[PDB]
Amino acid sequence: DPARSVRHIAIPAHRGLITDRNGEPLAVSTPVTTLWANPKELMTAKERWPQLAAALGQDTKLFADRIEQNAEREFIYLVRGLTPEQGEGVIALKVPGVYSIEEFRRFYPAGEVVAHAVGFTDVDDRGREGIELAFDEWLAGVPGKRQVLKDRRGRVIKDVQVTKNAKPGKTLALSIDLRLQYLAHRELRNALLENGAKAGSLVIMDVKTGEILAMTNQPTYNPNNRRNLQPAAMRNRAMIDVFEPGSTVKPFSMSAALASGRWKPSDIVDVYPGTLQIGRYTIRDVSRNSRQLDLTGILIKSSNVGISKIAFDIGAESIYSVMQQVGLGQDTGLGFPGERVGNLPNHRKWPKAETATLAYGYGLSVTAIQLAHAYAALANDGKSVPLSMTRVDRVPDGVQVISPEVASTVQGMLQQVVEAQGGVFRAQVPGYHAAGKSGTAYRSLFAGFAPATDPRIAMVVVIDEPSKGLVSAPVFSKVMAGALRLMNVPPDN
Numbered sequence: 292d293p294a295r296s297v298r299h300i301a302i303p304a305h306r307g308l309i310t311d312r313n314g315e316p317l318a319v320s321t322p323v324t325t326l327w328a329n330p331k332e333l334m335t336a337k338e339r340w341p342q343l344a345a346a347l348g349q350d351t352k353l354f355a356d357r358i359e360q361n362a363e364r365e366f367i368y369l370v371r372g373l374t375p376e377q378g379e380g381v382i383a384l385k386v387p388g389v390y391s392i393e394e395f396r397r398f399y400p401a402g403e404v405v406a407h408a409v410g411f412t413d414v415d416d417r418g419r420e421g422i423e424l425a426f427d428e429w430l431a432g433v434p435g436k437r438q439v440l441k442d443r444r445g446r447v448i449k450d451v452q453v454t455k456n457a458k459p460g461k462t463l464a465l466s467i468d469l470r471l472q473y474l475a476h477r478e479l480r481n482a483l484l485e486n487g488a489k490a491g492s493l494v495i496m497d498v499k500t501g502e503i504l505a506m507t508n509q510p511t512y513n514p515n516n517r518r519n520l521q522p523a524a525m526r527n528r529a530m531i532d533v534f535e536p537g538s539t540v541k542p543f544s545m546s547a548a549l550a551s552g553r554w555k556p557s558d559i560v561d562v563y564p565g566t567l568q569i570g571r572y573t574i575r576d577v578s579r580n581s582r583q584l585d586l587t588g589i590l591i592k593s594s595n596v597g598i599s600k601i602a603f604d605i606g607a608e609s610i611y612s613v614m615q616q617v618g619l620g621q622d623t624g625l626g627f628p629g630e631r632v633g634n635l636p637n638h639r640k641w642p643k644a645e646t647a648t649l650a651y652g653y654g655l656s657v658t659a660i661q662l663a664h665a666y667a668a669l670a671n672d673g674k675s676v677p678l679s680m681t682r683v684d685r686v687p688d689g690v691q692v693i694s695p696e697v698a699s700t701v702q703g704m705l706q707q708v709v710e711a712q713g714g715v716f717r718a719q720v721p722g723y724h725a726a727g728k729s730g731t732a733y734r735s736l737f738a739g740f741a742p743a744t745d746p747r748i749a750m751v752v753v754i755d756e757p758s759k760g761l762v763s764a765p766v767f768s769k770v771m772a773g774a775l776r777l778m779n780v781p782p783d784n
């Protein structure tokens with residue numbers, strides 16, 4: 292066994308602050324007191340063990356067995372993450388081989404409100420979920436290194452040289468607006484209670500900048516206290532759960548219809564008697580007392596038959612192209628851990644059955660983020676701005692995916708879906724014109740944007756297994772109203 296040893300050892304770096312877009316702290320690295328021991332030194336001071344064990348709330352015998360078992364180690368932890376005053380009280384004992392150190396632990400000041408977005412670090416302050424993992428290299432910084440001389444029992448008797456100072460991690464400003472985040476969190480929670488639903492998501496996006504202003508899910512968890520958390524509660528459902536968007540994609544089917552040269556909003560489709568047979572398969576409407584409907588009526592009534600007949604006429608290829616160009620079934624580029632791409636199925640040739648099902652959003656799988664990004668493109672006069680969960684100062688060039696005239700026309704149809712007789716009146720936003728589309732899948736969807744005249748915000752509300760299909764619209768109304776007021780958006784109604 293050696294009389295001495297030398298070791299280059301790490302100087303830990305301070306992990307970068309995560310903030311919201313206005314500098315509100317979301318993840319902060321705080322100094323904690325850690326008590327450790329050198330067993331080889333402890334072994335010389337056995338009469339001190341019971342007082343030390345007692346000061347660590349350990350049974351004397353369990354503690355003594357642990358030191359005896361680790362007799363040839365030179366390091367063990369006693370307890371991590373104390374108060375300065377707490378460790379002081381144990382160092383006050385002056386037990387040979389017992390040492391306090393100040394290390395870094397994450398605190399999450401908004402806790403459950405932004406847990407799924409921010410994620411969290413492990414005991415070693417390494418990113419393990421969410422933004423913490425996705426931007427770990429950015430946030431982590433670079434350990435320093437220093438040389439120590441140790442005696443026969445491995446205690447440090449000299450600091451020899453620092454070869455490298457630690458470099459702190461970098462601040463990261465998310466796209467999240469904490470004020471919008473708290474409003475969405477509260478309103479989604481209250482909606483689940485009032486509707487006896489057990490899960491849900493709500494996304495708010497800036498249609499001009501591609502920024503995710505809010506992303507909240509239920510259930511959630513306190514990242515400051517992860518004791519015995521149900522794994523369901525840690526799911527960022529908005530990014531990692533896929534669902535069938537159903538009626539919510541009909542505005543993309545209509546976009547292809549209006550681009551085709553073959554359809555204007557005043558054109559009529561006969562949907563009588565509210566069913567349509569396709570070989571063995573029958574398309575069924577929810578309401579079945581219509582004959583002639585104009586294209587705006589097809590959206591207000593959300594006629595499956597009506598959108599199917601339009602799709603037969605223009606062809607599935609036109610609709611598939613719009614859906615792909617607005618990002619359905621496509622990588623968002625966000626690199627969020629576990630983020631899903633979902634599924635926009637293709638065919639070399641589209642028979643009638645597959646054509647219809649595409650047109651009314653059956654057999655597709657999207658995330659709430661993808662559906663919000665699609666609505667954002669439609670709201671932004673047909674131009675898709677790339678998504679960001681970090682603050683955007685320099686907005687990248689968007690891609691024109693729907694002609695501005697067609698997008699403008701579809702916006703107007705979606706304003707009627709909210710505002711017109713027979714429409715989703717509970718999605719109406721006080722002081723503003725709003726636009727959007729419901730969907731019903733045991734699952735309630737609402738997607739939309741406001742103000743309808745000069746749109747600023749897209750929003751998706753998803754409510755899982757309510758206990759009564761239109762539980763999502765009033766949530767859109769409340770959260771859109773609050774978000775537009777917080778953003779000083781001038782009323783347009």
Ligand SMILES: *C(=O)[C@](C)(CC(=C)O)NC(=O)Cc1ccc(O)cc1
Binds near residue numbers: 575594
């Ligand atoms: C849209 O909200 C709706 C009119 C609701 C409905 C239950 O028919 N249409 C669809 O969601 C389209 C659709 C129909 C059947 C199915 O299995 C998935 C999607």
